Amino acid sequence: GSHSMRYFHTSVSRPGRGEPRFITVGYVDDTLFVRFDSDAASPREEPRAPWIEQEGPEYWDRETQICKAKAQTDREDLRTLLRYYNQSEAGSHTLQNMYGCDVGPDGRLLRGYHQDAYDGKDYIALNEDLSSWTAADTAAQITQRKWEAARVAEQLRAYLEGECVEWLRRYLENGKETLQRADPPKTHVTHHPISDHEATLRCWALGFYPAEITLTWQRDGEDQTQDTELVETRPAGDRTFQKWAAVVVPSGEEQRYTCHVQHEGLPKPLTLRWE
């Protein structure tokens, strides 16, 4: 199918407790493959997937250098943002950045991304054209002017259309055993009476990869969107994900309810009932 590569970065200041903590992780689809933590013993970018371990020491040296340089620029950027928002040096603040690319089944670029948030809020984002910016407020407009004058967007476009796609394609090949295998969900329905008059039906999906999935309950064929309790898809810790959806049903009406499961690993959507 389609695939994505993403690098995530978070710097969190801590006045009076040293310099900001910087953590960055890289993902292909829902698979973590590299990490870096500024508070680690001897910080270096570390592998987290077997198919990246074959990259040579030159690759790890350059990656670690980039990570350390990003930690430093984040520290400078956090100081700048205090000025832009007329804020005190007393408080903890957060700078987040994500960048990456999406490619289709053919390996063609579908789109690229580069975006930032300050204190959990949109700050500035590269537009899908990879040539213009969306600034969230008048502070980000200052960054926009600076990045326009420095032709940052042109540099990002070159990366996102070139190395981003090329190295994602490389990683997909080297890790094809896992990155190009979809594990379908194992599914079942559980029943828990609440009362003499009502019962909970819970539709379970376990052990699936990638994380994207749709679980829906129908009553007499009608989606129960409004009355369905849907928990966030969650990691099992073995690369796979879990999710459930629950409805409250009148006692005796259980057979009118059907759970429908859609997942890339399934050739056809599944329909399940309480047995």
């Binding site: 690759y59 980039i66 990570c67 340089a69 620029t73 540099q155 990366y159």
Partner: peptide, 6 residues
Amino acid sequence: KRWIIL
């Protein structure tokens, strides 16, 4: 492979 803000 990462990009570096030049």
